[PDB]
Design a binder for this molecule. Structure first.
Ligand code: NAG
Ligand code: NAG
Lengths: 23, 48
């Protein structure tokens, strides 16, 4: 985990989250 | 004169007296859930 983030995720986890994307 | 959404429902309309466009947003709704301890303990509930 990266302590500087708003959500303590690791560098690699951030990469994963940035790749996968009524009435 | 009329706009439509994916469901073919009305999205917006042009007012027939004054030619301005009005958006139509369906009135607030949602599911209602009841949070409860079993009735063998209490009849008090919370509502979500
Ligand atoms: C509705 O009435 C207004 C006057 O208040 C007029 O200017 C307007 O053209 C009328 N609209 C239609 C569609 O006849
Ligand atoms: C549930 O209520 C009954 C009374 O109708 C009582 O006899 C039983 O012991 C209760 N069980 C629990 C787990 O509270």
């Amino acid at each position: 985990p990266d302590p500087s983030k708003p959500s303590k995720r690791s560098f690699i986890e951030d990469l994963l989250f940035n790749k996968v994307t009524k009435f | 004169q009329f706009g439509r959404d994916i469901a073919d429902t009305t999205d917006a309309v042009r007012d027939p007296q004054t030619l301005e466009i009005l958006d139509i947003t369906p009135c607030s709704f949602g599911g209602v859930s009841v949070i409860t301890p079993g009735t063998n303990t209490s009849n008090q509930v919370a509502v979500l």
